[PDB]
Design a protein around this ligand. Sequence first.
Ligand SMILES: *[C@@H]1O[C@H](CO)[C@@H](O[C@@H]2O[C@H](CO)[C@@H](O[C@@H]3O[C@H](CO[C@H]4O[C@H](CO)[C@@H](O)[C@H](O[C@H]5O[C@H](CO)[C@@H](O)[C@H](O)[C@@H]5O[C@H]5O[C@H](CO)[C@@H](O)[C@H](O)[C@@H]5O)[C@@H]4O)[C@@H](O)[C@H](O)[C@@H]3O)[C@H](O)[C@H]2NC(C)=O)[C@H](O)[C@H]1NC(C)=O
Ligand SMILES: CC(C)[C@H](C)[C@@H](O)[C@H](O)[C@@H](C)[C@H]1CC[C@H]2[C@@H]3COC(=O)[C@H]4C[C@H](O)[C@H](O)C[C@]4(C)[C@H]3CC[C@]12C
Ligand SMILES: *[C@@H]1O[C@H](CO)[C@@H](O[C@@H]2O[C@H](CO)[C@@H](O)[C@H](O)[C@H]2NC(C)=O)[C@H](O)[C@H]1NC(C)=O
Ligand SMILES: *[C@@H]1O[C@H](CO)[C@@H](O[C@@H]2O[C@H](CO)[C@@H](O)[C@H](O)[C@H]2NC(C)=O)[C@H](O)[C@H]1NC(C)=O
Ligand SMILES: *[C@@H]1O[C@H](CO)[C@@H](O[C@@H]2O[C@H](CO)[C@@H](O)[C@H](O)[C@H]2NC(C)=O)[C@H](O)[C@H]1NC(C)=O
Ligand SMILES: *[C@@H]1O[C@H](CO)[C@@H](O)[C@H](O)[C@H]1NC(C)=O
Ligand SMILES: *[C@@H]1O[C@H](CO)[C@@H](O)[C@H](O)[C@H]1NC(C)=O
Length: 724
Amino acid sequence: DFNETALLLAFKQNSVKSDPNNVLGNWKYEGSCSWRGVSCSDDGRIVGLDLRNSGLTGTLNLVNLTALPNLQNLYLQGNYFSSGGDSSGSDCYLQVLDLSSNSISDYSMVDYVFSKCSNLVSVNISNNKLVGKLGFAPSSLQSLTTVDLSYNILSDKIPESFISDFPASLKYLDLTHNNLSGDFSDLSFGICGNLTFFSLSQNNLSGDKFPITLPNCKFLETLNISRNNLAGKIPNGEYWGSFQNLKQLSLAHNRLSGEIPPELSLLCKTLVILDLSGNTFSGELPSQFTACVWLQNLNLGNNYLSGDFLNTVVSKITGITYLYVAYNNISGSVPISLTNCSNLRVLDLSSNGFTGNVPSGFCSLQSSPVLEKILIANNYLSGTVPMELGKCKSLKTIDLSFNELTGPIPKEIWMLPNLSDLVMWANNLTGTIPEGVCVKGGNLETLILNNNLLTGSIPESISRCTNMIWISLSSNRLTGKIPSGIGNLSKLAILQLGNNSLSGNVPRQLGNCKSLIWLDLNSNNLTGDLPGELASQAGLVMPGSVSGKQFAFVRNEGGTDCRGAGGLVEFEGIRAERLERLPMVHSCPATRIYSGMTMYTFSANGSMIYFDISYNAVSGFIPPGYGNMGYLQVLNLGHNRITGTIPDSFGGLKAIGVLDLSHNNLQGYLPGSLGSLSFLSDLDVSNNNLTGPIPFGGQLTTFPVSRYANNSGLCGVPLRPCGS
Ligand SMILES: *[C@@H]1O[C@H](CO)[C@@H](O[C@@H]2O[C@H](CO)[C@@H](O[C@@H]3O[C@H](CO[C@H]4O[C@H](CO)[C@@H](O)[C@H](O[C@H]5O[C@H](CO)[C@@H](O)[C@H](O)[C@@H]5O[C@H]5O[C@H](CO)[C@@H](O)[C@H](O)[C@@H]5O)[C@@H]4O)[C@@H](O)[C@H](O)[C@@H]3O)[C@H](O)[C@H]2NC(C)=O)[C@H](O)[C@H]1NC(C)=O
Ligand SMILES: CC(C)[C@H](C)[C@@H](O)[C@H](O)[C@@H](C)[C@H]1CC[C@H]2[C@@H]3COC(=O)[C@H]4C[C@H](O)[C@H](O)C[C@]4(C)[C@H]3CC[C@]12C
Ligand SMILES: *[C@@H]1O[C@H](CO)[C@@H](O[C@@H]2O[C@H](CO)[C@@H](O)[C@H](O)[C@H]2NC(C)=O)[C@H](O)[C@H]1NC(C)=O
Ligand SMILES: *[C@@H]1O[C@H](CO)[C@@H](O[C@@H]2O[C@H](CO)[C@@H](O)[C@H](O)[C@H]2NC(C)=O)[C@H](O)[C@H]1NC(C)=O
Ligand SMILES: *[C@@H]1O[C@H](CO)[C@@H](O[C@@H]2O[C@H](CO)[C@@H](O)[C@H](O)[C@H]2NC(C)=O)[C@H](O)[C@H]1NC(C)=O
Ligand SMILES: *[C@@H]1O[C@H](CO)[C@@H](O)[C@H](O)[C@H]1NC(C)=O
Ligand SMILES: *[C@@H]1O[C@H](CO)[C@@H](O)[C@H](O)[C@H]1NC(C)=O
């Protein structure tokens, strides 16, 4: 062990606790320049060490490597290194340093880098565990272009002079996703001659005012302060006047208020991306923004904006690709001028005050239709769905949910070749679902039509919808049998057919749907027996692609009148307040409304979560296999003709919160096994032929007497004791 070689051997024996891949297997005494990751300069001294993405675990002490006299390049990123260089130490020759994507927590290490390493061009410490507060700036490092401290735990405030004390050479500074706090207005930027990238996004910065010296950075290309606590208004006057190159601006998701200042339009000579989303802004996008000819992506969503600016302003920017205006106060008709934007890929008008017709001109001169998504949900739109929409061959998503729409759905929409999501719920739509579905048009992921006037049958053709994830037809006029072909949909997760006229028997082929976690058949005309095959995926179910979708679930204190009211709905682009215009809301006031992204309740080997067949004519016995569903939280079989006994197997319903067997023909004893269900919070066994002792264990003695009423001689607490 001699000199540099000794140093590296020290690292392998000391810094590295495990090398499962044997990447260091050739670091072995007797010349170190042939070692894996080691690169040498002509003197034969190590000029670099590249261990990236090697699966190494250990305690990094940076000074232990940087003692290497000639080392200019160090890549340890994408490993398990923790702790870090810390200490203080020898001379540092580093030019490039990448420590990202490790476990490093010791800010002392960054202090060492900012102090000693005077030839440093770039430092990436991002995606680590660094805790503590920012120290002195690296004023002595005069080649330093690039510093990425993002995705750490850094806290307290950015020191007032921190940024102004950086060397003149600084191009890129990223503080994104830390714990930083304090007044944004207290930062000084100094001369700021080279800085083209600055991001504070996802922190705790606050205050009433923008920093006076930020406008010093005349060359800033992207300025991102999004997802902070900034309050007050967007600075007007000359504040934006000196930015020469500003391309990406994001003020999004802050507390900012007032109108959007006309002076902001000074940025229009450059701006290609503007995100003002998620603030309190009112008024209009100023007319000066017609100069915004290079603007590609405009996000004004989630404010109080109103007026005609989409017409007078945004119509005029011919190259706009993405337009997000949802959750605002805009009224009037959707401007038809909007259809002059021939590069528009996404148009989100959801949750505004729009009246009048859906735009019929969206792909005219073609050349050729580029539009992917049109979202107008939760407005006041009237008339029908224009057949012209059938012209945009590129449509991936149409969302017209919760408008005043009427008439049938033109065949042309069902023949859109790329259609993925057709989401039209809470309208007055009529007609039928065509036999050509998913054959003569796109192979759909979701079809959400609940709470319309649709009639006829679910077409046997729905079986070719093999991409299908989520089907909601509830509360329509549908008749006929549930087609056995639905069993061909191996990704189907949620099927809601409730409150229709469906009849015949539930096809046993439903049990062949490998992904089904949610089945609501309630309030139909169904007869026949509960197929045993409905439980055949129990234990096998894998969490699928229905995750990550906006939903709402409306809970009510009812009750028998309240069935069919509330429950689970697709929530994209809709405000909770519009939910109160759903049917039966007077009888069934929402007691609680859950909302969010959909997430599965199991990592793997799951079952059905939710099964409601109540209010049908179903007969036969309960299949004992149903008791094998370990993740089932709702089983509602009430108001049917079901006979036989309650299966002892129901003891394996370990997740069940709601079990409604009421108003059937059940007989025999309640299974003592029911006492072992620890989450059972709602049990209704009433109006059957049941007899004998009410199990004494678990929750059974905690229920109101009404849950046991009208049976054949049940006894024991809460009823009269069995030893009468
Ligand atoms: C300023 O800095 C932030 C990072 O802190 C950058 O924001 C990130 O943008 C990326 C790229 O677009 C997003 O990743 C994509 O996310 C989508 C799904 O995203 C949804 O879910 C996440 C999770 O909660 C959410 O954060 C996203 O939020 C965006 O969209 C809102 C509008 O709906 C908007 O109000 C919000 O500001 C944010 O805006 C960005 O996206 C919209 C695109 O719709 C764009 O208009 C705008 O300019 C911003 O880019 C959203 O609800 C996945 O499908 C993708 O595959 C991909 O993962 C990040 O989610 C996003 N925000 C974060 C991380 O907080 C900005 O781009 C940056 N601006 C500039 C110019 O540098
Ligand atoms: C897996 C998805 C389909 C779903 C949207 C998912 O994201 C979501 O977390 C589901 C599981 C939740 C959201 C609301 C939940 C219900 C909340 O409201 C209901 O009143 C309760 C009553 C009672 O507490 C029961 O335990 C079940 C039950 C009825 C819950 C069962 C599971 C949910 C249905
Ligand atoms: C600093 O390194 C991080 C890597 O951890 C870089 O972030 C990655 O960038 C790539 C390519 O842009 C993304 O696709 C990766 O997903 C990112 N990974 C993570 C975990 O975010 C970052 O690019 C580097 N910073 C600089 C300035 O180069
Ligand atoms: C941006 O950084 C560069 C360094 O890359 C700075 O350039 C130095 O500027 C001085 C003064 O003009 C020159 O004498 C040096 O020769 C430059 N160094 C190099 C390596 O070119 C530049 O000043 C910085 N920008 C500003 C405006 O501060
Ligand atoms: C077909 O299905 C519906 C839904 O289950 C049945 O009826 C409803 O009947 C109950 C009891 O009378 C009422 O409380 C609901 O309000 C009714 N809803 C509607 C929209 O009608 C209906 O009886 C069945 N029809 C046949 C052929 O018997
Ligand atoms: C904008 O719409 C919201 C509905 O979410 C409403 O409360 C508000 O009054 C409207 N305009 C205002 C006053 O900001
Ligand atoms: C159930 O369906 C009938 C007929 O479609 C309708 O009048 C009613 O609004 C629906 N009820 C609920 C709770 O959605």
